[PDB]
């Protein structure tokens, strides 16, 4: 807390030296729409995985499968922390997220030995849950990595079913303000390009765009 100054060496250009060395150029980056309100994997940095997003099953589908279950629509819990689970979703099986990339590599007999329930067939419907729908989304990506044709995700599984207020506790790794990053300590590039990459135009909380080239606008004046 208390507004720690950060140990990065970014700086705005002064009022004395000319603007030079335009084979790198920082400018302010402003996109069209806000993405911070959206789901975490519906944001801007995950757009390329947009076709990898699992189809959504909703609350009413989950209540209908609670009341009237199907033999091959497998409800699977993807929550990892055993200290944060307090209730049982009906007709659910426990396959925690951090083991999924190993779990689908097993045979059916090894799946039965290492989890106590049968391995789902690749044509069976699989429905995944988590606290917010984040561990279930990564698990759905791991389930779609293998050739599983029908994989669905209930976004906000436990927190809407049981009414809890929990989270999957995703870190989203951001450097500590004592950790000095790469381009300050290094002779990987020449001194002009090193000074021109480390400069920015404005405060260092917003996003910027780095230009690899620039030509002078001779047609203005």
């Amino acid at each position: 807390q208390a507004d720690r100054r950060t140990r990065h060496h970014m700086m705005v250009d002064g009022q004395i030296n000319p603007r030079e060395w335009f084979n790198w150029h920082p400018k302010e980056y402003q996109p069209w729409y806000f993405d911070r309100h959206k789901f975490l994997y519906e944001q801007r940095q995950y757009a390329q995985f947009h076709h990898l997003l699992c189809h959504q099953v909703y609350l009413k589908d989950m209540l209908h499968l609670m009341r009237y279950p199907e033999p091959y629509t497998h409800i699977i819990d993807c929550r990892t922390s055993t200290q944060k689970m307090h209730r049982w979703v009906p007709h659910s099986l426990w396959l925690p997220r951090d083991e999924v990339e190993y779990a689908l590599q097993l045979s059916a007999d090894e799946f039965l030995d290492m989890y106590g329930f049968r391995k789902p067939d690749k044509s069976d419907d699989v429905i995944l849950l988590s606290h917010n729908g984040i561990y279930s989304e990564q698990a759905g990506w791991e389930w779609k990595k293998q050739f599983f044709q029908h994989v669905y995700n209930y976004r906000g599984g436990t927190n809407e079913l049981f009414g809890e207020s929990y989270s999957d506790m995703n870190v989203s790794d951001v450097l500590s303000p004592w950790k000095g990053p790469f381009p300050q300590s290094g002779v990987f590039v020449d001194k002009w390009s090193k000074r021109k990459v480390l400069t920015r135009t404005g405060p260092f909380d917003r996003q910027y765009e780095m230009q690899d080239f620039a030509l002078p606008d001779l047609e203005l004046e």
Binding site: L59, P90, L161, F162, G163, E164, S165
Partner: peptide, 16 residues
Amino acid sequence: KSDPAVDNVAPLRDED
């Protein structure tokens, strides 16, 4: 150990 304000599983369990 949790007390939720709203719940969707419990009113379906209570009728059954």
